[PDB]
Amino acid sequence: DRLTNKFQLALADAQSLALGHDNQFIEPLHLMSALLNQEGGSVSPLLTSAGINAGQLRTDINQALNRLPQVQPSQDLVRVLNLCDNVAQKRGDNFISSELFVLAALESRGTVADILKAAGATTANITQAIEQ
């Protein structure tokens, strides 16, 4: 799609994570976990730059993943990805990058947004990190 190759690869990993954890749906949480674990990925350094502890974030995200029902993208994920698209359009980006997911997730309510807020993420410090 309009997604960067790195973002597409993280999505594939998110699917593997959902499968490996016996979850029926790939949730924004799965995508986030994948992005946090992506060597050379943009998400971890973006968070560190925004003043958010990426290490503790993956722990809280893993805790949330551990709470999901066990038994394929969820509508939650489709929704957040749609906002990523809109955000890329508003910022004038040619493609949808991983950093936008952090911003879109923060503005999409639900568990991931709650975790990000508690971790110190705000539309302001994430947007600043993105522009930087």
Residue numbers in the entry: 4 to 74, 82 to 142
The authors write:
Heat-shock protein (Hsp) 100 protein complexes are critical cell stress responders that solubilize and unfold toxic protein aggregates and amyloids, thereby enhancing thermal and chemical tolerances. They are members of the conserved family of AAA+ molecular machines that form dynamic hexameric-ring structures and undergo ATP hydrolysis-driven translocation of polypeptide substrates through a central channel. To better elucidate the Hsp100 disaggregation mechanism we determined cryo-EM structures of the ClpB hyperactive variant, K476C, bound to the model substrate, casein.
This improved the density for the individual NTDs and connecting NBD1 linker enabling the identification of a trimer NTDs form the channel entrance. Additional NTD density corresponding to the other protomers (P2, P4, and P6) is not observed, indicating they are likely disconnected and flexible. Remarkably, density corresponding to the polypeptide substrate is identified to extend up from the P5-NBD1 pore loop and directly contact the P5 and P3 NTDs. An additional nine residues were modeled into this substrate density as poly-Ala. Based on the molecular model, NTD-substrate interactions are proposed to involve helix A1, which contacts the substrate approximately two residues above P5-NBD1 pore loop in protomer P3 and ~7 residues above in protomer P5. Surprisingly, we identify the substrate entrance channel comprises of an NTD trimer from alternating protomers (P1–P3–P5). We identify a substrate channel entrance that comprises an NTD trimer which binds substrate as a spiral, extending its unfolded state, thereby facilitating transfer to the AAA+ channel.
